[model samples]
Target chain A: ATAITYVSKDHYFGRNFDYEISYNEVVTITPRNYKFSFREVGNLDHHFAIIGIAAGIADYPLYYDAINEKGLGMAGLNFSGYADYKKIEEGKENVSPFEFIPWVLGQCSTVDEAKKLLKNLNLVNINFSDELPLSPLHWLLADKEQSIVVESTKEGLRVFDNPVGVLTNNPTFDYQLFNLNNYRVLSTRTPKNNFSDQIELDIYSRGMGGIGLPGDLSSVSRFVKATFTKLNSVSRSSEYESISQFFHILSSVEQQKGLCDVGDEKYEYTIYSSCCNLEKGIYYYRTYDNSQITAVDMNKENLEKDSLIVYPMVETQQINYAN
Target chain B: ATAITYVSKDHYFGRNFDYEISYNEVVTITPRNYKFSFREVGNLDHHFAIIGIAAGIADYPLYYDAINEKGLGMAGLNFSGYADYKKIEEGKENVSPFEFIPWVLGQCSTVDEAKKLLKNLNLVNINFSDELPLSPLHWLLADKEQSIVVESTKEGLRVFDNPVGVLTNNPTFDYQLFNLNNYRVLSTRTPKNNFSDQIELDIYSRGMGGIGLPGDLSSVSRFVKATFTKLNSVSRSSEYESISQFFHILSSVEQQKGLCDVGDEKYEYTIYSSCCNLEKGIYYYRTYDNSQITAVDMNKENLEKDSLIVYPMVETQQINYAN
Candidate 1:
């Protein structure tokens, strides 16, 4: 399986702070591949936006990205051929793929909100388009204090609370964070020397130079190192630094050469984007190639009519992207 | 507070493994430090012997050193200034300082054995020799899987299971181990990578460098690290290597300079020894400097005579440098 790399950092907007970042990767599938697209979809009154992307065989909307007014963010990652989705029962009315993102986001704003609202809805996967097959995927949701990685496995939905608050791609989310126990201590600051005061000791004995930290960029190591660094980096006073530190730590998991493999499939790339809600209708993003910052001002009066409407597949057209 | 540096390890004999190691600078305090000549008390039946010493102020035996039948051993570290010995209750019969080690070890074989036997014994300090002032001390006991550290504090007698199975000069045993947590990961090992190919990845990564392992040598770190390594190193087929590995890990805790400080008024040193039981009557020891192994062969005849003969002040024994 190929790996995806994501990097994000905190940026300031006036007195308030906003977090922004970019993700890039190559993805593989059995048949077809499509260019990734995103849109900011929501009304100023509702305070939400669905970052739509082309996904799945049914030409329906597969919500791979989204953010809300309360600073809650969600993103979908590849689960490959390991996912299972079934149709709605006879009495159950199925929600269209185009409507699922809005439906999920419209009802919830925070992690707690999403967690509660998720219980009332049954997301039935229908064949909306015939072009491609449904791809198995998992989703990660994060807020200021916590991150939850939810995997809709074949058996059932498995939810793991990321105590470390940092998540990267690959394996199962739960398994990635648990693998950190096998490395040496990874500390961002210098440790106190137990023997520094001893005049009898050689100069080389003054500090910890012998111990080494794990050097892999694997999901497990990345999670461990990133989490440890971020947790240790929290500043004494500012909430902005806390979030900024988190994004900085996430940047450590960036994929490098010989690290991520997407199998025989070529040109299948991973896309990463960042969103900051400065206020209602204002969403920001930075792509891997484009460093120039862009904003979607939904609060503008003409946004509803001027915004382009597009679906994850070819058919739906209620979402739009500016850049 | 200053930290004390010590070496600890695990040793296994036969099918059962034991964690063992020793210290280098332990204060061998005696009740008669102000007077009386220390002498050697030998237990033929248990194959153990020790140089008994005391200032003679305390009535009960104050064990500073001892050698057992199986080459297993123990020694006392400085506990005087830090310990508070209350006056013996009026009318209670006084016990001699020469007989304590024999009295304690005579009832038990291993560290665990000694702990179980000594758990309820009421040891009182009474004025025996007028020349020496009353002072109390702590003990370090070991056998082949674990080391047991005992301290008679002002509050009361407290026992600690040496997590690293090693002890050195002290602020007492428990304090030393607790201090290691700040520098090392002393608790559980969480998994690092959750990749789908983790099972395959495990084949390539082995030993200390392959995964995250505690990397410091503090008492607590040594305790935790040695314990985990020993626990994880246990094998059903090879017992000796497992034991050797335990000892190697314990020895990994470096006795660095300025690692710890005992006040000017107090004695600071560590003593290292080994103990083993060869049959019921044979005990053995190899003290810190003397790698030359020695043994005491005890029989039924010796057991009958010394069965009730308690030697108080076990630390006052003269050093027997014999071939």
Candidate 2:
């Protein structure tokens, strides 16, 4: 999975949920007063309203990601070998993998507020169920103003400020950030004739500046691709153009079907792409089967209610053919 | 420019002409009896019929690239500092950059046949016109069975067997081929747990196999990207799918507007992408402004005529908006 943030007239946050299989997740809304029970930590009877995609197992919103009514956004990407959730500690707030989003987004309204909560929080190794085991993961937490990456490693809990507003499952966030330096020479302008002075080189093609951008489906490659595409992206300030541009940024790193074989004739692909208007409480997305965007407004739902509002994703290609 | 070849139900050949400007080139055909006048080698009163995109200058066809009725294909890519066309040699077939395509494509039925002509050939330093000087270039010549690279440097004419049917600008073809060793570890399947075994690692996402594939637009980067995308690409055997897949491969390295600035507020972009049916004599193309594929069949033209048959490119966006 890869998550990214974009700012236009309205601040936008989004991610591409890439995997081999779909968990039948739904666009769910957890309104204020919807009870969240966290194992090892305790239960909350009331919390801030939240909206995101989640797997509803036994009526529990197993959030892959979420954004609070306060405009803060958070997403968990596969961290695998590097994610080391520890045992429950008495002095710290022990939150399990499935409970982490609610633990932070349930109360906090800003990235700084979430940071204050993380200073003493512990990601406890408590599985939601035997069938649903804890998946190794790290997180991207962001609001309109700033973003940060949180990783629980053997070394300890580490939080790094995200300057590029991009994240992909990988070795680590810091290592990914450092890797950008290797591509310091990349530019949006035609590169100066640096290959040789003897032979006059024409700007043979338009994208000569992006000659080194990775086109692979690997995590590191996606990280670089996403970062470069996002940083150099240009779009009008209008919501229509901004939303279209945001999805284009994600498409740059999209994993195509049959390109990355997982095994047994199965391949990993981008299951769905998502973008949310953080300030407007509007969640928009496009599934693999669909190229058209669908929107779910959090404000339209009864946010003050205690029940969960769910919308099944539109998973069909909607082609507009004109004769 | 980036040139690539594919083999499906039929042998396929094509390239992306990436540049900020166009010279109003047309899909042109030169009949078997249409004469080709070389500066030093004199005029060929009769030869094999040819078809490709070309700038028609004073009734002469200056081919950017072309193929003969015999199914042989040839394309010139930016060679920059390394391309050194020599002065006319007494015993050599001195062909200028503008005449090299016709000189070779007019007779060769296969890469092997072209190799024989290349033995005594010299890329002579002759300009077509004072305003249109010679552009640094190397060539990728391919037939149904094999492919090769042709370069004329300070050391003289050099030919290399192209094991991979791909070519891009600059850095020399040998160095470009050797650079593939750096990406030998890339795969189409999920990578095994090689980072560490102590911590449990999940196949977090698909495309981990292509972790190191470069996405930048540099000549070297395009070389790697186009190679990986082409080699790992999967498509059906049908011509429809093959052509669709070919364009998709080119799009993987496409330069979007505003991303590759050349100068004077003008940005470089993919001017056009083309694919040819080597066996059927059908040339297909899509301009940057128009994504719908347009076809020009050489067999449909008067191949026996002495005058040039030209079809201007379709340069408008074709949208099928279903209302």
Candidate 3:
């Protein structure tokens, strides 16, 4: 899964996914006073409310996205067939495949808390339904200061500190990070031409420093583009401005329809894009059909109840024409 | 000058550039009816009516571009410090550097004819005004079947076959072509997952084929992206689709505002773009301020006349929103 990332220094975090089974909709879930077991967490207790993202599912037990009242965000993206879940051990704290989002978002508030809680956690491959039989996934967790990626691959569960905070599917996080080394020579400063002894001049072009970043729509290219876009982005202080800014960052790496065909004429595109404001307890999103951005405020809504609320999105585009 | 190009395989071509001086305006000029004097060519006559794109004018006879009634197109873009011109020789058909575009387009109907015409041609460094010195430039010459890049560098005058039929500035066409070797591994096909023995599923991502194409705006990266985008493009019979498609291809490498700093805080952005329809003998263009595609029919214009007909462009955009 090429998990998404937001602005480098920001009031919130922005992350997106380019996948087949997710749509742009708003979902709200509140923490229950009592809890049951996902697998073997027999002594479950609720402490905080959760306002989760609506990707494939919006309900409590099966969200592929993670955002709760604890100011933490997590998302599962494709691991390029490298993901391998562990078998439940006799003494280990077990969590089902689908319960990981809620498990992390329900208990952790920061990356430190999530990492500490994940140290003893076992991600089991028990299926919820026959339809959702353990999708291969890698999760990216982020707090205000930093982000980390967790991949349960053949080499056991490996965690990588996301210095860039942007993720795209495949190639593993290690390979993806090392791939950026190729772009180290790239700069934002305008270049001077020293072609030969006689003709050195101030000859240059715009974005000359970004002379070698990836521009394709693949996960690898998107990772480079997102990092370049976010890393070079100007610092902004306004929450409203920052919210709008992060959306542009997601849009920078967003996939277009009819552009990607894997094989057998099966096309892949970014169905919907999303970003979460951890400090504000709000989730923001937009769909391919609609460019109008929609927001759901968790702090402003009901958080003391136990029911999960799902808001279906209308596909009509709201265009603001220039006069 | 960033020349525009597009094709349904050579019956047509489209080209565009974004810059401070080039515009949607097209000029029509017929060959001189009488003799002209530069250094040689005592008996010069016009054989074709020409349509030209203007960026920065460098005085008499030195236009930034060339296209003629014979469906021949040629352009001189910034070669950085690599361009090496010749001084006037006793027996050479000496022509001012600025006179090359008109000479080639007026005299040659094909690339072979142009090559022969350039055999004894001398790009003499003669200046008309102190305000304008010759900009170091190389030429991309095109016919229906193939294009060629002519750069007179330290190694002498070299012509390279542009199979991709795309050209940018600075890096020599040879270096740019070999640079594509860096991306030979890139394909539009989905990648197979051979990560390990147990994980060899139909594991693939959409557009995984283009995993390594460079995405930056540097001349080198733009050359690679342009070649990739053009090569992967579909063959469309309709010129309408081809025109829009070519614009999108150009847009893939177009510079955004403020991204590039060329010293003294001076910025470079795509100012304007054009596409020459080699088959129809028409010129199409758009400016940064406008998205509406405009056309100039070469046959319909007064190409029989000797004076250059300049059409000035208005900077305001023409937009029509749908209901």
In order, what are the TM-scores of chain A for the candidates?
Answer: 0.60, 0.98, 0.90
Candidate 3, residue A63: the lDDT equals 60
Please provide, for model 1 over A99-154, each residue's C-alpha lDDT reduced to its tens digit, 9 standing for 90 to 100: 44455554466678777755544445754355543445566666555567666556
Per-candidate TM-scores read 0.40, 0.67, 0.61
Per-residue lDDT of B95-159 in model 1, one digit per residue for the tens? 23334455555445667777776665444664335664444555666666556666766777677
Candidate 3 wrong stretches, greater than 4 Å? A1-185, A190-208, A226-260, A265-323, B1-5, B14-39, B43-45, B56-62, B193-204
TM-score ranking from best candidate downward: 2, 3, 1
- Summarize candidate 2's per-residue lDDT along A176-271 as a digit string, tens digits: 999999989888877889889999977645466777677788888889888988888766787766776687678678776667887897877778
Runs in model 2 with CA error above 4 Å?
A: A1-215, A234-251, A256-258, A269-323, B56-59, B193-203, B256-268
Candidate 2: residue B244 lDDT (0-100): 62
> Worst ten-residue run, lDDT, model 2 chain A?
A314-323
Local distance difference test scores for all models: 0.41, 0.82, 0.65
Scored against the native two-chain complex, candidate 3 gets a DockQ of: 0.16
> Docking category for candidate 3?
incorrect
Sort all candidates by DockQ, best to worst. Answer: 2, 3, 1
After superposing candidate 1 on the true structure, give the runs of residues whose Cα lies further than 4 Å from its correct spot: A1-63, A69-71, A90-99, A143-147, A159-164, A170-186, A192-215, A234-247, A265-270, A278-282, A291-293, A300-303, A306-323, B1-323
